[PDB]
């Protein structure tokens, strides 16, 4: 078990690097702190370029590029080796809640904001290529696996899937009762994990050939409290386990097959915003509003 | 199962089934409302 203090404020997001050897953490302090996973878990960055809260972190699939969506209306792209802010996408009129970069090349990025716009990008160009206008605020976006689709969840409860080729809404999924704070797509690309404020975590069949009712599995046991934070969700790399942020200070991991809890680990003092799995070894980190990151082995 | 109820500062990561499963046996009648609640200090639990 390892404890990683040193954020002055709430930790909203944390991600392992795809090679497993290094870790990124960021939150309300606006700084992005890069940690070694092994050894003394020492720090060796301060990334300083933002002016507002860092809402989400994502690496690209090779790990050279770190993407940070911020409430400052900008998306920063960092070089992981040098720590230089490579680019500033500044196209959004309101807070940027989320981002996610494409699995396959080229280096596309998509974004969701409280202005109700879902904007696609290309890192080569300074402007948005395409904007889908949602009627209400968007809290989390991810691509699909094929990099052709944006999936967005918002405060309008429904899950909306766009197609970049037709520029049109293509299918919608209904069942969640409240704001979709978090979306995450499995490494195989078949399934999506969703967290919503209705105290349910669900798995949906994202594949083209799903049944008409796409909700395959329902998980329970997390809590959303009065702080209404954007509690995120993540998959294990093998797809056997799922984790969800919960505001009741307990760190939840479910077995996807048996639908049981497997770990419900105490020790945080605040709302847990994101939980992430290490890619190779069974190490789990959980980021909480108590200004601490907890890292520990599971079996 | 394998985890004591009189425990603090657990050094490893216990499984759900090995930490949240019931304490067995009957309750005693010799404990009032204040005595049975999981208090840390005289009137209650402060965290």
């Amino acid at each position: 078990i390892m404890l990683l203090s040193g954020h002055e404020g709430e930790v909203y997001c944390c991600k392992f690097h795809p090679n497993g050897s290094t870790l990124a953490s960021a939150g309300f302090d606006r700084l992005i702190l890069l940690w070694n996973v092994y050894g003394d878990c020492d720090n060796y960055a301060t990334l300083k370029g933002h002016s507002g809260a860092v809402m989400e972190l994502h690496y690209n699939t090779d790990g050279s590029m770190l993407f940070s969506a911020s409430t400052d209306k900008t998306v920063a792209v960092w070089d992981s080796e040098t720590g230089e802010r490579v680019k500033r996408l500044k196209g959004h009129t309101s807070f940027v809640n989320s981002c996610y970069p494409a699995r396959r090349g080229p280096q596309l990025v998509c974004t969701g904001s409280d202005d109700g716009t879902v904007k696609l990008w290309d890192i080569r160009k300074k402007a948005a290529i395409q904007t889908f206008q949602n009627t209400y605020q968007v809290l989390a976006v991810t691509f699909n696996d094929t990099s052709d689709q944006i999936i967005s969840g918002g405060i309008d409860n429904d899950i909306k899937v766009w197609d970049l080729r037709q520029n049109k809404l293509t299918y919608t999924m209904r069942g969640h009762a409240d704001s979709v704070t978090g979306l995450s797509l499995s490494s195989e690309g078949s399934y999506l994990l969703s967290n919503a404020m209705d105290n349910t975590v669900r798995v949906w069949d994202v594949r083209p050939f799903a049944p008409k009712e796409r909700c395959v599995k329902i998980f329970q046991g997390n809590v959303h409290n009065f702080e209404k934070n954007l509690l995120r969700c993540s998959w294990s790399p093998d797809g056997s386990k799922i984790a969800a942020g919960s505001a009741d200070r307990f760190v939840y991991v479910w077995d996807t097959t048996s639908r049981r809890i497997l770990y419900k680990l105490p020790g945080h003092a605040g709302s847990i915003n994101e939980v992430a799995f290490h890619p190779d070894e069974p190490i789990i980190i959980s980021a909480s509003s108590d200004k601490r990151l907890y890292m520990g082995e599971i079996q | 199962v394998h985890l004591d109820p009189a425990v603090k500062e657990v050094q490893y990561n216990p499984t759900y089934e090995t930490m949240f499963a019931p304490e067995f046996g009957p309750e005693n009648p010799f404990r009032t409302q204040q005595m049975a609640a999981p208090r840390n200090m005289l009137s209650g639990y402060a965290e």
Binding site: W35, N43, M295 | V10, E47
Partner: peptide
């Protein structure tokens, strides 16, 4: 590159709360 920051890692236990 970007400077080494204030963070330190250390070994810790968790400690379950009562209840």
């Amino acid at each position: 590159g970007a400077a080494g920051g204030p963070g330190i890692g250390r070994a810790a236990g968790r400690g379950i709360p009562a209840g």
